[PDB]
Design a protein around this ligand. Structure first.
Ligand SMILES: *P(=O)(O)[C@@H](NC(=O)OCc1ccccc1)c1ccc(C(=N)N)cc1
Ligand SMILES: [Ca+2]
Length: 223
């Protein structure tokens, strides 16, 4: 996250770290046994780490649970990043409480102008690299379909939205991928892609979760 603030330990109780020996992507807990992330984060051998604030230090609230199954969206296209979403089933159900909690799925798509909270342990610089050990947060508005398409001509599909600031300086970045964009207490987006981080006229692009709610519910109902 570039130009955000320190969230505070366990203030984002649905935030997940995906670990394969090191943190490589975020995710969101949507019920005690399922995590949603970006399909471009797919890897074999994932361990889900819940209750994290400092990812390099055991502070007492975490639960580490291995994934038993990963299901990438049937139409994920790795070249265009269309349908960049995947579900991960946990080997055991997590124990939910105030500090690790699930986020609910949306009943409606959020509109442009809605303020959201984006979080993750990704890079904090737009030039150079510095990975924080504690969770970072950014409040940012969903941008209009038109400004999003003008910033990325010929690349935005109906399954994507832009969020952030056209003047730059504040954005999600590498390592934040797969993480949550929550607006009005509901998961509306997944950190998916962008051109650099925090550059002028290149806002972050996010998977539009409201288009996938039927696929998520049907899939978790039979797996
Ligand atoms: P994420 O993996 O942390 C990163 N996206 C990623 O690199 O995959 C998509 C991609 C591939 C090749 C070039 C560009 C993008 C990511 C997530 C968000 C932003 C952002 N500026 N908001 C940037 C990179
Ligand atoms: Ca920790």
């Amino acid at each position: 996250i570039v130009g955000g603030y320190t969230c505070g330990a366990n203030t984002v109780p649905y935030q997940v770290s995906l670990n394969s020996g090191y943190h490589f992507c975020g995710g969101s807990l949507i019920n005690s046994q399922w995590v949603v992330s970006a399909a471009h984060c797919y890897k074999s051998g994932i361990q889900v780490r819940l209750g994290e604030d400092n990812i390099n230090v055991v502070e007492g609230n975490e639960q580490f649970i291995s994934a038993s199954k990963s299901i990438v969206h049937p139409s994920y296209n790795s070249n265009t990043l269309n349908n960049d979403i995947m579900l991960i089933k946990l080997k055991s159900a997590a124990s939910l409480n105030s500090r690790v909690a699930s986020i609910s799925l949306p009943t409606s798509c959020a509109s442009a102008g809605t303020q959201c909270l984006i979080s993750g342990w990704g890079n904090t610089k737009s030039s150079g690299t510095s990975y924080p050990d504690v969770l970072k947060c950014l409040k940012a508005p969903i941008l209009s379909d038109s400004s999003c398409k003008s910033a990325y001509p010929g690349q935005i599909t109906s399954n994507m939205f832009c969020a952030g600031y056209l003047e730059g300086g504040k954005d999600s970045c590498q390592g934040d991928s797969g993480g949550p964009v929550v607006c009005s207490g509901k998961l509306q987006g997944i950190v998916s892609w962008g051109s650099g981080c925090a550059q002028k006229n290149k806002p972050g692009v996010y998977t539009k979760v409201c288009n996938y709610v039927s696929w998520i519910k049907q899939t978790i109902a039979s797996n």
